């Protein structure tokens, strides 16, 4: 059954662990596996404590974001539907015992710095179970790098990324992401000037503006294969419709309103409700190293804020994608 911590964070790797993001769900940390950046993002399950306010997971509970998380991965590897824009798998391990000491010192460094709504993950006994998912080290989430990138037009690749990757989802497996807030999208600079993705057999690119976006996080997502659906089904949480502050809280009620409180179904509206989140919070919350002020560029802007009043008149990432002006 489930392998001591030491076999997944030996000690080089756990000594190596910087602690780079959090949620109710538990904690991020970046290491280094086989002289490879890689993110483990660790999750208690089947104990009786609360964290951070809630009760954890079974694993039946947690298997729709394992499932989906692999299902997503393998899209770069794909022909008549292929993308790199999810993030990338490398394996998924159970683990039992109390906390790590060195992961409590990065969680305290974390905590010291940048501050925590988490609950000190002290308390876990050896017994405790966690699922340990290590991913591919996707970058900076764009919440991170809203005073950092260059200008309108890198948003605009952002935004056009994002699209195509959520049109390939929703061809390839009826995906919708369902939490895709900014804290979920990452960015990583990237040589390549053009970025290929392939959508029912068919290949176009995307002017980079030198980053590569990854879209992460599962834990809301739903999808299908041949007639099974995998999803979370949150039609008896009540906390996550009551959110408030932030333009994000409104997308779930919103979701809610428009599936009958019904998670099973297939809504692929749902990814345009957070791409249209995400296109304001790029007009209103981030700073650009280049402003507002040539022609070409006030352009892009213009061409933006048309996108922004009008998507929500589509009815899917991948109707965006395909008939949409911003993209021609
Ligand atoms: N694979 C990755 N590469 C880089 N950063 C990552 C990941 C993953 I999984 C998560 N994160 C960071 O941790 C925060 C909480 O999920 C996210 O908002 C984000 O800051």
Avoid at 15 to 23: F, M
Avoid at 116 to 140: W, Y
């Amino acid at each position: 059954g489930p392998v001591p911590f030491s076999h997944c964070l030996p000690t080089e790797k756990l000594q190596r662990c910087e602690k780079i993001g959090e949620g109710v769900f538990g904690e991020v940390f970046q290491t280094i596996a086989d002289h490879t950046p890689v993110a483990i993002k660790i999750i208690a399950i089947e104990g009786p404590d609360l964290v951070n306010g809630s009760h954890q997971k079974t694993f039946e509970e947690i298997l729709p974001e394992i499932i989906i998380s692999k299902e997503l991965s393998l899209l770069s590897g794909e022909v008549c539907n292929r993308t790199e824009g999810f993030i990338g798998l490398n394996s998924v391990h159970c683990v039992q015992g109390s906390y790590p000491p060195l992961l409590l010192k990065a969680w305290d460094h974390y905590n010291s710095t940048k501050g925590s709504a988490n609950d000190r993950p002290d308390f876990f006994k050896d017994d405790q179970l966690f699922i340990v998912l290590e991913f591919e080290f996707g970058g900076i989430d764009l919440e991170q790098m809203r005073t950092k990138l260059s200008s309108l037009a890198t948003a605009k690749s952002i935004l056009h990324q994002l699209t195509a990757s959520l049109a390939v989802a929703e061809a390839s497996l009826r995906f919708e992401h369902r939490d895709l807030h900014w804290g979920n999208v990452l960015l990583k600079k990237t040589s390549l000037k053009k970025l290929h993705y392939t959508l029912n057999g068919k290949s176009s690119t995307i002017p980079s503006c030198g980053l590569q976006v990854s879209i992460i996080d599962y834990t809301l997502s739903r999808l299908e294969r041949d007639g099974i659906v995998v999803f979370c089904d949150v039609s008896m949480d009540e906390d996550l419709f009551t959110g408030d502050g932030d333009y994000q809280f409104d997308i779930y009620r919103l979701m809610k309103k428009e599936n009958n409180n019904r998670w099973g179904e297939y809504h692929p509206y749902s990814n345009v409700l957070w791409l249209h989140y995400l296109t304001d919070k790029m007009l209103k919350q981030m700073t650009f190293k280049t402003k507002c002020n040539t022609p070409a560029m006030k352009q892009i802007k213009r061409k933006i804020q048309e996108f922004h009043r009008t998507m929500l008149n589509f009815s899917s990432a991948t109707d965006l994608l395909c008939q949409h002006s911003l993209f021609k």
